[PDB]
């Protein structure tokens, strides 16, 4: 009657922010055979008809900088590389004194290094030559591999592929993932239109610096996201609405010399180059990049005064992986000079742009510990066509502020690569136990 009674309810729409163990999803066509370093087979197939329920009247506060899905993906990828490289060939005996010389041509770059090597037997040696890029070798007073004084080196199996394929992160039973579907959202704050999904969209684990490639496009206007704009020690993630076209090529028809360095082990060296000695490069249409840079600066004036000057410059210094647009393109790892893309100075109001790229075959674990990998060389003139959907910009903390702000690219932490795609997702747990009062009493 007038005195209410407690009544338990099962299956109430109630959730609280929490963290759990997320799993994956990788379509059904991703029949690629062999075995990609990640999703091939090892992942659960994706639902042919995904479901998305729009939570009407629901307003939720998201936070892309304090998300746990980023920390999981950042470490899941790292463990995925350690797993695919465990059974592959170890290149410890390759750290021998390399008697190198210039490549056969007419800024020397490539080096034709000859060395001794262990054969299938444990007695006679083997005087076989190779062709390593200058970035992978360092002299000593004859050269040596760069990692021999720091890290152990292991060659990646040639049966695996470095191509990123979409990987959907899902939550187990009892959990849910919320997707903020507003066309203008900086990743933080309350979300107007919110929806729920069991799995995220196709996220390809691309690892690039400075330039974000093959990512998701922003809606309407280009989106700007930063953890603390007033703090110049925090990166500024950018997202493009219209993607810019980029073309990369390594015009060097290389050769794969299969050397045998003992029982079962087989080292893939670089043979004689067929064709001309041409360095790798990447092209960007001058017409499109001129419109995109002018479209981003218009969004930058909404945070540093309406009438201000914005200048762009290349990296200040540091490691190689951050000062150059580094990534993967068909197997080889690139390191493109980015001094031609950030050579602008915007105030308040016809072919392509080529980039001088370099190639390394030895790459060291970004954990800073001493574990490096030798990327086997690729045969044939490689050519990759990719999108560029965002930027990773920094700001030089000038003491004379509010005058003119300079933006310099950067990177080094691949968490920002996952933050660029996980800004619209967060983990919550469903608690279906909820009590409520009503004039209902049971029996005696």
């Amino acid at each position, epitope marked *: 009657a007038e005195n209410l009674w407690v009544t338990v309810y099962y299956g109430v729409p109630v959730w609280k922010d929490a963290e759990t163990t997320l799993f994956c999803a990788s379509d059904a066509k991703a029949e690629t055979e062999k075995h990609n370093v990640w999703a091939t087979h090892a992942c659960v197939p994706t639902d042919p008809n995904p479901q998305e329920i729009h939570l009407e009247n629901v307003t939720e506060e998201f936070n892309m900088w304090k998300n746990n899905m980023v920390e999981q993906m950042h470490t899941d990828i790292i463990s995925l590389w350690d797993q695919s490289l465990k059974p592959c060939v170890k290149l410890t005996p390759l750290c021998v004194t390399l008697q190198c010389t210039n490549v056969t041509n*007419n800024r020397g770059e490539l080096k034709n290094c000859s060395f001794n090597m262990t054969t299938e037997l444990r007695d006679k040696k083997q005087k076989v030559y190779s062709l390593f890029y200058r970035l992978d070798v360092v002299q000593i007073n004859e050269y040596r591999l760069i990692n021999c004084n720091t890290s152990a080196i292991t060659q990646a199996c040639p049966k695996v592929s470095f191509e990123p394929i979409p990987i959907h992160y899902c939550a187990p039973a009892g959990f849910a993932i919320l997707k903020c579907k507003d066309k203008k959202f900086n990743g933080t704050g309350p979300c107007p239109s919110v929806s729920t999904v069991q799995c995220t969209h196709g996220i390809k684990p691309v690892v690039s610096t400075q330039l974000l490639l093959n990512g998701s496009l922003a809606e309407e206007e280009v989106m700007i996201r930063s953890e603390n704009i007033t703090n110049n020690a925090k990166n500024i993630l950018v997202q493009f609405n219209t993607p810019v076209q980029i073309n990369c090529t390594r015009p060097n028809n290389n050769t794969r010399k299969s050397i045998r360095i003992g029982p079962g082990q087989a080292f893939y060296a670089t043979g004689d180059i067929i064709g*001309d000695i*041409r360095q790798a490069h990447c092209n960007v249409s001058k017409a499109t990049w001129n419109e995109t840079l002018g479209k981003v600066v218009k969004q930058l004036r909404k945070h540093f005064g309406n009438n201000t000057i914005i200048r762009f410059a290349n990296s200040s210094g540091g490691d190689l992986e951050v000062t150059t647009h580094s990534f993967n393109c068909g197997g080889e790892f690139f390191y493109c000079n980015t001094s031609g893309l950030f050579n602008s100075t915007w105030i308040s109001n016809n072919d392509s742009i080529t980039l001088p790229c370099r190639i390394k075959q030895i790459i060291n674990m970004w954990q800073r510990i001493g574990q490096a990998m030798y990327a086997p060389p690729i045969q044939g003139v490689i050519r990759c066509v990719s999108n560029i959907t965002g930027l990773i910009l920094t700001r030089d903390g000038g003491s004379t502020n509010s005058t003119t702000e300079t933006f310099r690219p950067g990177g080094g932490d691949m968490r920002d690569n996952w933050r660029s795609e996980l800004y619209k997702y967060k983990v919550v747990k469903i608690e279906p136990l909820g009590v409520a009062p009503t004039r209902c009493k049971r029996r005696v």
Partner: antibody
Amino acid sequence: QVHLQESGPGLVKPSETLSLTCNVSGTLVRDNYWSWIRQPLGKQPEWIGYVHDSGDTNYNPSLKSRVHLSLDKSKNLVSLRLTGVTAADSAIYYCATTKHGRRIYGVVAFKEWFTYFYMDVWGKGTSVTVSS
Amino acid sequence: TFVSVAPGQTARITCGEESLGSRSVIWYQQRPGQAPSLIIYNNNDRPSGIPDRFSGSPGSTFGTTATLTITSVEAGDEADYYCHIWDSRRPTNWVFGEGTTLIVLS
């Protein structure tokens, strides 16, 4: 038409200095490139070096420290010098105009090209024998 | 090096080493007792005065030697044929390649 004529001594003592002259008729010695070619008896021709105005002159890496070319614009003729001659310099020296070319294979911007030359209008040629 | 070809047929001449990169081969013809003349410059480009019967191998092939093809062989073509190799992988060749004398039979 272009008529080139060589004229020299034809006999130079060993360890001396050869002086040849290419009397040009048909065009100016400044608006064209020039090159000299020698050829021993029963052998293949050997390039010596090209000469052009504005200090554009390169020598043969095997005959670098001995040859000295020049162009006489006031007389419209090509000259040639060769100090310290031996028995191996006995050949037939020619005088021919040179038209340059640009072979591109790469991306141009990265200097992934090379300049090739070819002589089209040769001369009658002069005979030079080295003996004491 | 000598290669005899019957009159009216097609002639083949090999000169220079094997290609290591993009080339621009220059061909010449030396009449017996005369001065060498320019035949084909830039692999396969003929100047004014040379018929279309002469054709050289394109400099875009990597691994093949410079080949000079002469269609419709005549007694007048009996002379020496030298080549000048312009290779992007090799230094400038100041000595022409050892020629090949064309022998007109019949």
